[PDB]
Each structure stands twice: as C-alpha cells, then as structure tokens.
Ligand binder design. Structure first.
Ligand SMILES: CCCCCCCCO[C@@H]1O[C@H](CO)[C@@H](O)[C@H](O)[C@H]1O
Ligand SMILES: CCCCCCCCO[C@@H]1O[C@H](CO)[C@@H](O)[C@H](O)[C@H]1O
Length: 297
C-alpha cells in the first residue's frame, strides 16, 4: 500500500465537471477613531451561476500525488446587493441608511488550486491522504440604480427615494490567496464510491477594490486583510461505469471568516487620498454543486 517504493509518472486521471456556484461576500468599513465600530456594509450575493470545473491528477508514487485544479463561471449572473450605514454613533446597532440594488451581477469568478497529497492509506478500495496547497480565487461585481431609504438630518429612515435607472453604479473586485492544509479520502464498495475533502487555512490574504462611479462622488477604495481563516468541506458520490471512468456528483461549502485589515481611499474629484489602519473588513462563503467525470488513463 503506502509502503511500496516505486515511481509511476504514468498514473494520471482527469476530472471535468459542470455545475453551479452560489455565494455571498460582505464588504465592511470601520472607524478606528470611534471605537472601531462598523459604519458600512455591502452584501453582494448571487445564486446558481453556471461554472465549468476541472482537475488533473498525477499519482507519481504510492506515497504522493500532485494536482492542479480550477473552475470559472460560464458567463455572468445577475445577483443582488445591499448597502447599509450606521451613521448614528449614539445608536450603533441599528442602521440609518439602506440602499437596495436588484440590478447587480456577478461579472465573473474563478479559481485555480495546486496541491500535493501525502497518502496515509492507499488501497484499491480506500484512500486517505494529507494535503498541502495553494489556491487563488477572484470575484467581480457591478451594481446599478436601485432604491433607498436614507436618514435626513433630524430624521430617521424618512428620506425614502429612488435612483436613476442605470446611473450611479459600483464595481467590486476581490482576490483570495490561500495557502492551506487538508484531508481528503474515499471508500469504495463494489463499483460505488463515497468521498470527502476538508481544507483549512489561517494564512489567507484577501484584497478588494471598490469603485464608486459618479462624476460627483467618484472614489476608489482598496483593502487588504491578512492571516485570515478559511474552511472548506466537500463530499462526493460516484459510480464506476467502466474500470477507469467514474461518474460522480459533488457538493462543496467554503468560508472565509471576517477579519479587519487596512484600507486606502482615493478621491478622484479632490485628488485626495486617505489611509486607515483596520478600517476595512472582508468575508464570504460559497456553495458549489457539481457533477462530472473522473477518467483514469
Ligand atoms: C461553453 C462556454 C460558453 C460561454 C458563453 C457565455 C455567454 C454568457 O455570457 C454573458 O453574455 C451576455 C450577453 O451577451 C453578456 O452581456 C455578459 O457580459 C456575458 O458574461
Ligand atoms: C471549456 C472552457 C470554457 C471556458 C469559457 C471561458 C469564458 C470566459 O469568460 C469570461 O471571463 C472574463 C474574466 O476575465 C469575464 O470578464 C468575461 O465577462 C467572461 O465572459
């Protein structure tokens, strides 16, 4: 089993699949000089965005395998976005302004992953291995128009208006660099196979770019968070239609826990910039449902 000294650059298997990606990311702003309370929060979300997913696995030795994976959206997907503010420092906890944007879309999203697997168990009917790898994912959104419910000077959720259809918009990009460790495995009875994979990271580095388009309030925000936590849980079920062709179905969840980081503001109008330590926060989570084929050459 895992105690067999040999080399097999010959052992390779490919994995191609289709499915959907659903998720949500929360963009937060904090005021250091005010207890570090939350003052802004943008909630970008979207469901069933079609994606193509694939992997190439090299089972070089009984002890270790190398793998490269990736997925990307197959076109855009309309979503939703909500922007709230807590301008009342005497009542932080209840939002004072809420802007809704149904006209939002996930322009695109993708991810690649390179890893190594150290097999603890490697038999014909069951596999258990440690993992170590690196992943990078990107997201890009755009919100347009929408309605609001702001708070006047001496009022509260009174200034209930509406935005110019298509005007004032916002662009939001993100990047997640994730070095990680994991556990993967699968048991096989007859031609049926059940498997799972778990990932963890405490070294995540996320960064985002928020574009506020409006020849009036045209600002650019940039944030970066470090040593952020990441968790992932995936499970699959499949059948060996042929000795070396597995048809399978899979479900994956993953989360990036919120943490504070630094942010930089760029006001194009006044050509003024502003830096604020621990002024930003970033978090997200995703659900990936997929089905496909794993061919072992
Ligand atoms: C097999 C891969 C097919 C990829 C094609 C995806 C087509 C959907 O893609 C979408 O089409 C819209 C209409 O033109 C555009 O406005 C969007 O920007 C684009 O993302
Ligand atoms: C078989 C594999 C098909 C892959 C289809 C890829 C279609 C490319 O998709 C494109 O990705 C860009 C990201 O840079 C987006 O900005 C574009 O709006 C999107 O259409």
């Amino acid at each position: 089993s895992t105690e067999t000294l040999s080399f097999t650059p010959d052992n390779i298997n490919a994995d191609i699949s289709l499915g959907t990606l659903s998720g949500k990311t929360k963009e937060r702003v904090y005021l250091a000089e005010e207890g570090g309370r939350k003052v802004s929060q943008l909630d970008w979300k979207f469901n069933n965005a079609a994606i193509i997913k694939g992997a190439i696995n090299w089972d070089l030795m009984p002890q270790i395998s190398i793998g490269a994976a990736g997925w990307t959206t197959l076109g855009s997907r309309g979503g939703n976005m909500v922007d709230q503010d807590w301008m009342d420092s005497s009542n932080p906890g209840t939002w004072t302004d809420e802007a809704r944007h149904p006209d939002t879309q996930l322009n695109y999203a993708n991810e690649f992953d390179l890893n190594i697997k150290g097999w603890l168990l490697n038999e014909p009917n069951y596999r258990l291995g440690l993992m170590a790898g690196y992943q990078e994912s990107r997201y890009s959104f755009t919100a347009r128009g929408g309605s609001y419910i702001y708070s006047s000077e001496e009022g509260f959720r009174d200034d209930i208006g509406s935005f110019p259809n298509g005007e004032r918009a916002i662009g939001y990009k993100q990047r997640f660099k994730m070095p990680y460790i994991g556990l993967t495995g699968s048991y096989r009875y007859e031609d049926f196979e059940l498997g799972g994979t778990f990932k963890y990271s405490g070294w995540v580095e996320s960064s985002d770019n928020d574009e506020h388009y409006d020849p009036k309030g045209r600002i650019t925000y940039r944030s970066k968070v470090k040593d952020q936590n990441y968790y992932s849980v995936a499970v699959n079920a499949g059948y060996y239609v042929t000795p070396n062709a597995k048809v399978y179905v899979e479900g994956a969840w993953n989360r990036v826990t919120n943490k504070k980081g630094n942010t930089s503001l760029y006001d194009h109008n006044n050509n003024t910039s502003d830096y604020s330590k621990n002024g930003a926060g970033i978090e997200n989570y995703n659900f990936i449902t997929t089905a496909g084929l794993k061919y072992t050459f």
